[PDB]
């Protein structure tokens, strides 16, 4: 019940996402950009 | 239990449909991109040889 | 005497029914119109089809929202009815 | 019954409640994304033929790029691309994992899901939407200064419609979040409703619904990512 | 009545009053009446033009490279070439249709439409 | 007056509304999409096949809503929340 | 001091009327729009008639499809009212 | 509060809803079909006859739903189920 | 309270729904048909007369269904079924 | 529970429904006919005189129904059938 | 038992709400369509504005008039409620 | 309670008012925006030229909307006949 | 003998349901129409993408605002019901 109201999970999720973002920030996107520029 | 069996059968049907119809075309596109990059690298090597 | 919760839940069910009615009508009309635009564009020039999928999927996104958002609120009406007492 | 809701593995910390099920779902999605990233890094080969994961990642990056430059160039918003591609793959994996057969019976006559997509919880969608909101609001801020950002957003394209513009600055986050929630939340209900029939009749409608839900999840992920890029461009202009 | 002027590149073909001008523009069949709105359209590859006067037999013309230009005062059909039904010989219209070349096949189809074979 | 009676009456009316809106939306959307498809086929006779792939997506996007609503009828009639 | 089945049947009748009215509205609008497409196509390209019927029958099909489900739901509501005491 | 009285009241409200929906659908569909017919004739007046045949297949089908409404409305009002 | 009062109240609401639906259908259909007629006249003024033959066919049709609603709505408020 | 109260409630609801429906119909029809007229005049100013003749016809068909609504609507509230 | 005037007022407010809903829908849609026609005419032809307002205004009248009618008559529902 | 019934009717009436106003305003704005988008696409240089009539129409539509807003405010808060 | 708050709550939920039905319909149809315009513009001029946003964003904006205005007042009806007693 009371679905709309967010719990503390709101914060925790961000952490997870941020962590994922970090990888995509450095260890996924830049290598692929280098690969495409090289190609 | 019973609902679990029904859901498992549904998932099996979904997987069968995917492998039968959508997997072949996505695999074909993957292979096409692989062949395109292979041809590009081969043409680069041929240009170096020339 | 009649249970207050009973009448409150009846009103909530009517409200949720209206939510679905409006949301589904809007979604159907918007999807039809956007698909008409996409089909006409593709028919007029097939070579452009690849591009039209970008704006089209924007339109549906700006339409389905107005519908699916309502769905969320409908839940709030039916499953956790405010002032259910 | 339907028991719409009933977050499992709930706990409390620092005087605030946390939903264990959604946290687990987002953790699974994040670890899958990190595993794919590591697999790509291991099999990164520019000179050689790229690996399948490389094909997927470069396809996503090329797409998000194309839309970016179509809206605004990289040099203006270099960091948007990683953000959008992240959002995309994360949401897509979260929605697609649900296709797995993790539905069982609770002995109460109501179905239960071991893995429930985090988007089906308001917390996840609110987190993503507010993250994007802050991100592009700050982007516009330092694109045109702290003083000018509120002025431009209030005046919008045409100043005399200032009130309406203000509502949009509030609408974009909510519209970004709630829609996603709904798009997934329905599925959570739908599958549960599909559990009403017997197995020998439940297999088919569930099959059709999940087959369509795959496309639904893909479309919603793409829509959210494209709208994120689009709002980023809107906030970063002139 | 409206002034129909079927005119070709090399010369003028026919001119005079008419009550109805039916043809097949690229968008679709169009019938022009005396007070039609000003219009510019491209006749289909194998367009045929039928002109109807007040009590005279229709002129059916097979037109290649046709462009239709309607004005409140006059109506003109600028054709790369155009041949009337009387001069159109059925054998050629039949034999040249559906040939290897698209232009010649379209011309033959226009001739057949003018004759009536379509 | 049994409360369940009022609950069920409200649920029936709500479901009627749900399907009324669902059918209105689905019918009009499918009609519009089919109008586009028919006009496209008329314009380009051979385009018909290449027009199905977009058109069906529209249909898939439309029927979805209808299908979704078609479920809630059960949820409203056979599993009325808060029936008590 | 009233028969519950009376309220149940009144609600069922209201719901079924909503069903059938919405179905009729959708069917009529969709049929008219598809027919407009067909008539325009026939007017512009009479030769295309044989081609245009095939898609048209599809367009009507779905448009009529939904309608019949609502029609079918009459059986579920005005004769087999769920929740009837 | 006679039970059958509430039955009949609900049936009348129903019948009214069915008629409203049917009339709306029939009117709008007929208007759209007539619009197509009029535009076609205006663009190509000589095609008038050949346009009537398809135009009916549309209109002749539109009211197919509308009249159906009438039918069931009778079942709603004149012979109300559960009365 | 008198059940017949409930019957006639439901009849009034049903008649209102009937007449509103008929009005919406008639207005939309007549507007669309008139738009087609006006566009055609602007296109081919000499087809004016030829355009009324289809236009009226639509009009009378669009109005026909509408009038049926009247032909029934009065009944609801004057000969109420089940009264 | 006075009966005339229910009579008046039903009559007012029905009258409001008819008035709203007539307003919708008149507004939509007038807007559509006006769009046709405006486009026709835009294409050719000379036609402005001509287009009024068909345009004014359409409004007559539309407004009539609307003005009929009011009329019949006036019947329900002012002299409610079945009222005692 | 309940005060009859309570039911009368409730029904009158519902009727006024319906009247406003219908009038707003009709006015908004018709005005939007007329404005679409005007905008398209101006875009496709710059200087017909001086003439384009002459029909457009008429059209808006034919639309907005109806709205006002509703508005005016809705007052009767909410203030001069018949049979109060 | 007479006040309860009259107030419930007032809220329902306000809901109808806002529903109709929302439908009208949203669809009218969509249609005017369609016109403006088409005009811009065909004539990119008419931007300022096209703003004028478009805002005329939008202002009229929003005026109808705001009239509905004001009367909903009257219904819900200053409900007559309380 | 019914709780006045119960009747007020039922009325408030029905009113909110109507507000959101109307808002959903308006938003969906307006966004669909604007998206149709944008898609057609893209089909005719693939390079117009950027210049077409300033129109589109305006239209959607307006539309969205109206819808969301309704949203606010629906909450006002439900969570803080005027006249509740």
Coordinates of C-alpha atoms in Angstrom, one line a residue, chain D residues 38-213:
Chain D
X38 CA 34.4 -6.5 -18.0
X39 CA 33.8 -9.1 -20.8
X40 CA 34.0 -6.2 -23.3
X41 CA 37.2 -4.9 -21.8
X42 CA 38.7 -8.4 -21.9
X43 CA 37.7 -8.9 -25.5
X44 CA 38.3 -5.4 -26.8
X45 CA 40.1 -5.7 -30.2
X46 CA 40.1 -2.8 -32.6
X47 CA 42.5 -4.4 -35.1
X48 CA 40.7 -7.8 -35.0
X49 CA 37.0 -8.6 -35.5
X50 CA 35.0 -7.2 -32.5
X51 CA 33.3 -9.6 -30.1
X52 CA 29.6 -9.9 -29.7
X53 CA 29.6 -7.8 -26.6
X54 CA 31.7 -5.3 -28.4
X55 CA 29.1 -5.2 -31.2
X56 CA 26.4 -4.6 -28.7
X57 CA 28.2 -1.8 -26.8
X58 CA 29.4 -0.1 -30.0
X59 CA 25.8 -0.3 -31.4
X60 CA 24.4 1.4 -28.3
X61 CA 27.2 4.0 -28.3
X62 CA 26.7 4.8 -32.0
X63 CA 23.0 5.2 -31.5
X64 CA 23.2 7.5 -28.5
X65 CA 25.9 9.4 -30.3
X66 CA 23.8 9.9 -33.4
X67 CA 20.9 11.3 -31.4
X68 CA 23.3 13.5 -29.4
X69 CA 24.8 15.2 -32.4
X70 CA 21.4 15.3 -33.9
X71 CA 20.5 17.4 -30.9
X72 CA 23.8 18.8 -29.6
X73 CA 27.4 18.0 -30.3
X74 CA 29.7 16.0 -28.1
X75 CA 32.0 18.9 -27.2
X76 CA 29.1 20.7 -25.7
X77 CA 27.9 17.6 -23.7
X78 CA 30.7 15.0 -23.7
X79 CA 29.4 13.4 -20.5
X80 CA 25.8 12.9 -21.7
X81 CA 26.7 10.0 -23.9
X82 CA 27.9 7.7 -21.0
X83 CA 25.0 8.7 -18.9
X84 CA 22.4 8.0 -21.6
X85 CA 24.0 4.6 -22.6
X86 CA 24.2 3.6 -19.0
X87 CA 20.5 4.5 -18.3
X88 CA 19.6 2.6 -21.5
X89 CA 21.4 -0.7 -20.8
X90 CA 20.5 -0.6 -17.1
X91 CA 16.8 -0.2 -17.7
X92 CA 16.8 -2.7 -20.6
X93 CA 18.5 -5.4 -18.5
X94 CA 16.2 -4.7 -15.6
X95 CA 13.1 -5.1 -17.8
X96 CA 14.4 -8.1 -19.8
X97 CA 15.5 -10.2 -16.8
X98 CA 11.9 -10.4 -15.7
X99 CA 11.2 -12.7 -18.6
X100 CA 13.0 -15.5 -16.7
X101 CA 10.7 -18.1 -15.0
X102 CA 10.9 -16.9 -11.4
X103 CA 7.2 -17.0 -10.6
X104 CA 6.0 -19.5 -7.9
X105 CA 3.1 -20.2 -5.6
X106 CA 3.1 -18.9 -2.0
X107 CA 0.6 -21.6 -0.9
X108 CA -1.9 -18.8 -0.3
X109 CA -3.4 -19.1 -3.7
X110 CA -1.5 -16.0 -5.0
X111 CA 1.6 -16.0 -7.2
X112 CA 4.9 -14.5 -6.1
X113 CA 8.0 -13.3 -8.0
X114 CA 11.5 -14.0 -6.9
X115 CA 12.9 -11.3 -9.2
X116 CA 10.7 -8.2 -9.5
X117 CA 12.0 -5.5 -11.9
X118 CA 13.2 -2.5 -9.9
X119 CA 11.3 -0.1 -12.2
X120 CA 8.1 -1.7 -10.8
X121 CA 9.0 0.1 -7.6
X122 CA 8.6 3.9 -7.3
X123 CA 12.0 4.2 -5.6
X124 CA 14.0 3.1 -8.6
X125 CA 12.2 5.3 -11.1
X126 CA 12.3 8.3 -8.8
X127 CA 16.0 7.8 -8.2
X128 CA 16.7 7.7 -12.0
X129 CA 14.4 10.6 -12.8
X130 CA 15.8 12.9 -10.1
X131 CA 19.3 11.9 -10.9
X132 CA 18.7 13.0 -14.5
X133 CA 16.9 16.1 -13.3
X134 CA 19.8 17.3 -11.2
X135 CA 22.3 16.3 -13.9
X136 CA 20.8 18.4 -16.7
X137 CA 19.8 21.2 -14.4
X138 CA 23.4 21.5 -13.3
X139 CA 24.5 21.1 -16.9
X140 CA 22.4 24.1 -17.9
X141 CA 23.6 26.0 -14.8
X142 CA 27.2 25.9 -15.7
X143 CA 26.4 26.2 -19.4
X144 CA 24.8 29.6 -18.9
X145 CA 25.5 30.4 -15.2
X146 CA 23.6 30.0 -12.0
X147 CA 21.9 33.4 -12.4
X148 CA 20.8 32.8 -16.0
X149 CA 19.5 29.2 -15.6
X150 CA 16.3 30.1 -13.6
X151 CA 15.7 33.1 -15.9
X152 CA 16.0 31.1 -19.1
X153 CA 13.9 28.2 -17.8
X154 CA 11.2 30.6 -16.5
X155 CA 11.0 32.6 -19.8
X156 CA 11.3 29.5 -21.9
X157 CA 11.3 30.1 -25.7
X158 CA 8.8 32.9 -25.3
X159 CA 8.9 34.9 -22.1
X160 CA 5.2 35.9 -21.8
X161 CA 4.3 32.2 -21.3
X162 CA 6.5 32.1 -18.2
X163 CA 4.0 30.3 -15.8
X164 CA 3.5 27.4 -18.2
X165 CA 7.2 26.9 -18.7
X166 CA 7.6 26.6 -14.9
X167 CA 5.2 23.7 -14.8
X168 CA 7.4 21.9 -17.4
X169 CA 10.4 22.3 -15.1
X170 CA 8.3 20.2 -12.6
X171 CA 6.7 18.0 -15.2
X172 CA 9.8 16.5 -16.9
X173 CA 11.0 14.5 -13.8
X174 CA 7.6 13.2 -12.8
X175 CA 6.7 12.3 -16.4
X176 CA 10.1 10.7 -16.8
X177 CA 9.7 8.6 -13.6
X178 CA 6.0 7.6 -13.4
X179 CA 5.6 6.5 -17.0
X180 CA 8.5 4.0 -16.5
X181 CA 6.9 2.7 -13.3
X182 CA 3.6 2.3 -15.0
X183 CA 5.1 0.6 -18.0
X184 CA 6.6 -2.1 -15.8
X185 CA 4.0 -2.0 -12.9
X186 CA 1.3 -3.2 -15.3
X187 CA 3.3 -6.3 -16.1
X188 CA 3.7 -7.1 -12.4
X189 CA -0.1 -7.0 -12.1
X190 CA -0.7 -8.7 -15.5
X191 CA 1.5 -11.8 -14.7
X192 CA -0.2 -12.1 -11.3
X193 CA -3.6 -11.9 -13.0
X194 CA -2.4 -14.5 -15.6
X195 CA -1.8 -16.8 -12.6
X196 CA -5.6 -17.0 -12.1
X197 CA -6.0 -19.6 -14.8
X198 CA -4.8 -23.2 -14.5
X199 CA -1.3 -24.1 -15.7
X200 CA -2.6 -25.7 -18.9
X201 CA -4.4 -22.4 -19.7
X202 CA -1.9 -20.1 -17.9
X203 CA 1.0 -21.0 -20.2
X204 CA -0.4 -19.4 -23.3
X205 CA -1.6 -15.9 -22.3
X206 CA 1.6 -15.6 -20.1
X207 CA 3.7 -16.5 -23.1
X208 CA 2.0 -13.8 -25.3
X209 CA 2.2 -11.2 -22.6
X210 CA 5.9 -11.7 -21.8
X211 CA 6.7 -11.9 -25.5
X212 CA 5.1 -8.4 -25.9
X213 CA 6.7 -7.3 -22.6

